[PDB]
Amino acid sequence: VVWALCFMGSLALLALVCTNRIQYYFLYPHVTKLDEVAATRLTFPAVTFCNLNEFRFSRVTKNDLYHAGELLALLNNRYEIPDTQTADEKQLEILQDKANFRNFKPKPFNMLEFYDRAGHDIREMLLSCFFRGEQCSPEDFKVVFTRYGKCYTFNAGQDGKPRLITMKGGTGNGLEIMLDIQQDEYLPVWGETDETSFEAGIKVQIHSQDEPPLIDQLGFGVAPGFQTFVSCQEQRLIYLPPPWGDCKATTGEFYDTYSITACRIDCETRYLVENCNCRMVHMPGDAPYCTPEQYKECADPALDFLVEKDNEYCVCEMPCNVTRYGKELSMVKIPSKASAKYLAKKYNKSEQYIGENILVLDIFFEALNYETIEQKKAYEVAGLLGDIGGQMGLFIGASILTVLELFDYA
Amino acid sequence: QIRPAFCYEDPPFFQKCGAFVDSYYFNRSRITCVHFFYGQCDVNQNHFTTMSECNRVCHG
Amino acid sequence: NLNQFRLMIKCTNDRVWADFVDYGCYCVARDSNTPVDDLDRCCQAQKQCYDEAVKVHGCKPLVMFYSFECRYLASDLDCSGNNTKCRNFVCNCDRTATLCILTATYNRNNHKIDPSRC
Numbered sequence A: 001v002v003w004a005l006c007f008m009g010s011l012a013l014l015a016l017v018c019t020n021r022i023q024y025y026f027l028y029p030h031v032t033k034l035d036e037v038a039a040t041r042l043t044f045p046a047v048t049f050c051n052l053n054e055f056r057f058s059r060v061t062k063n064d065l066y067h068a069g070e071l072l073a074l075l076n077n078r079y080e081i082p083d084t085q086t087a088d089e090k091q092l093e094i095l096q097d098k099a100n101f102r103n104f105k106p107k108p109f110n111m112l113e114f115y116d117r118a119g120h121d122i123r124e125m126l127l128s129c130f131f132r133g134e135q136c137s138p139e140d141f142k143v144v145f146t147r148y149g150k151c152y153t154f155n156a157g158q159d160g161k162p163r164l165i166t167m168k169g170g171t172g173n174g175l176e177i178m179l180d181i182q183q184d185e186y187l188p189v190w191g192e193t194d195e196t197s198f199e200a201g202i203k204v205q206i207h208s209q210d211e212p213p214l215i216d217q218l219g220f221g222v223a224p225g226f227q228t229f230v231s232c233q234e235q236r237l238i239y240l241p242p243p244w245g246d247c248k249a250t251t252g253e254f255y256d257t258y259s260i261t262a263c264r265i266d267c268e269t270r271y272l273v274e275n276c277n278c279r280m281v282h283m284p285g286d287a288p289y290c291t292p293e294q295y296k297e298c299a300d301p302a303l304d305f306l307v308e309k310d311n312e313y314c315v316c317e318m319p320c321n322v323t324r325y326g327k328e329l330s331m332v333k334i335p336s337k338a339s340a341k342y343l344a345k346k347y348n349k350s351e352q353y354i355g356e357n358i359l360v361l362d363i364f365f366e367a368l369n370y371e372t373i374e375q376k377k378a379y380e381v382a383g384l385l386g387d388i389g390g391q392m393g394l395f396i397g398a399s400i401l402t403v404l405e406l407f408d409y410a
Numbered sequence B: 001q002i003r004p005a006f007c008y009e010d011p012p013f014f015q016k017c018g019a020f021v022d023s024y025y026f027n028r029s030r031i032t033c034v035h036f037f038y039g040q041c042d043v044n045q046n047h048f049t050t051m052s053e054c055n056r057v058c059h060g
Numbered sequence C: 001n002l003n004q005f006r007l008m009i010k011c012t013n014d015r016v017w018a019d020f021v022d023y024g025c026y027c028v029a030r031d032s033n034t035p036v037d038d039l040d041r042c043c044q045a046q047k048q049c050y051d052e053a054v055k056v057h058g059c060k061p062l063v064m065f066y067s068f069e070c071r072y073l074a075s076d077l078d079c080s081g082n083n084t085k086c087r088n089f090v091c092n093c094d095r096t097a098t099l100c101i102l103t104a105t106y107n108r109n110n111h112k113i114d115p116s117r118c
């Protein structure tokens, strides 16, 4: 009677609730969950570094200068030492002679070979290196080419070598390197080009072994004449794939694991090949290497445009797994007055040289604890059913029993 | 006017209004279509269920 | 360089790049004395434009990079984002030529002709 009126009107209201709950499930919502995870160990990251100077002056040959002199602003477009040169006496004489191309026959030239040969050598830069009380050596650093040229990665975990671990907070449980940045080997700067800079020091990037460096964009700097402390905190961010989220798991274009940096390097490579018909020497793939003329006229400008101005060519999908390292940096001076002669004598340099070229870098963790920030599925099937059955009880009084009754009755 | 005006609009990257699904949009810098995850925010028409359709309607 | 020209063409035209390569006397960026039709006349003005870029501004139009923006309207193709005289000038050369291509009619019989004609 009126009961049936009230029963179906109540059931209509139950229906609109169940439609709400069901449509909501199909949004595949997610929430973000924060957690501090205590740990007995941490995998030490990879540490990439580059000298800010790309080519050693004493390694540039007559042939190098012929091909790459204009790119490096050592020569004008007439293949001569520019009158706008700003050099000292002795370097000029060396370069003037080196630039004498009268009756010179150019030989084949390649930028990758030039970088590999003229780039700073870890064997000369690395004055000392310790990790967790164990002595390390140039063999512990893997060569990696970047826009800076010939760079070096500690703890790369490539070529079948395992990744290192830390187990306590503090300086004793990390890396300490002493470096000579070798300013007497810096190329004279006579102009402004993408290959030279006004600065002395190194650029460094701390990153997961699963991601390549993008050190020109994402690194931090470290200055000569200081010991620099870098206290780190690991942070792991986890995202959900579709339909919940939009993270990308893998990729099968130049690298194994997917990461933002892998995506950017893929894009940059594609962009140079598309617009210049060549790749810079640090990029992966098969295309021919840009000549120095191509670097100057097409490759440097195109990469600069893409990296600074373009807003559409490359838009990278978020990765499912991101490891970030929060960093707190601080410095003290090296050398003290009291230690300068010791260092000068030990490395056969003057005291002034030591002051302008030596640096120490310490990279360690504040604590083993890492923070995790994770997207979790917010309303799965279980939550959907138990919700619907909980609303059935609210509206009608229906039970799991009530249903199997009227389902057997009909 | 060779391709529809909506081809030049940015798709709604990272915006979630429901399930994320494979989709394709016209990239006006590459001048070709590119995969992305569409989250049902129908802000414009620059999104296609297939690469070929996107390249048909927008590539030119 | 011709990669950016090729892209400007794709930006405004479905006509595959191959059809402009070795068309008539001048296409693309080749030299001659007399253009076979109006399409070939576009390339002539382009070649003349590059020649001007080299001799007056010191550009290397066949090597240098420039940037441009593809817009809804062909005529809205934009060169103003370039940061040097050379990049602006050459971008403009290619823009003029791509638009001119739109006015001209695509013959198929002066594409890859015998050197006899040119």
Ligand SMILES: *[C@@H]1O[C@H](CO)[C@@H](O)[C@H](O)[C@H]1NC(C)=O
Pocket: A210, A238, A257, A320, A321
């Ligand atoms: C991805 O995240 C899972 C946990 O969600 C973790 O076990 C795995 O190590 C991560 N992958 C990488 C490459 O770090």
Ligand SMILES: *[C@@H]1O[C@H](CO)[C@@H](O)[C@H](O)[C@H]1NC(C)=O
Pocket: A348
């Ligand atoms: C150190 O001084 C100069 C550095 O080049 C060199 O001539 C000399 O042989 C070196 N001596 C020693 C003992 O290393």
Ligand SMILES: [Cl-]
Pocket: A264, A267, A268, A306, A307, A314
């Ligand atoms: Cl980029």
Ligand code: NA
Pocket: none
């Ligand atoms: Na809700």
Ligand code: NA
Pocket: A192, A193, A194, A195, A196, A197
């Ligand atoms: Na520079």
Ligand code: NA
Pocket: B028, B029, C007, C067, C068, C069, C070
């Ligand atoms: Na463009």
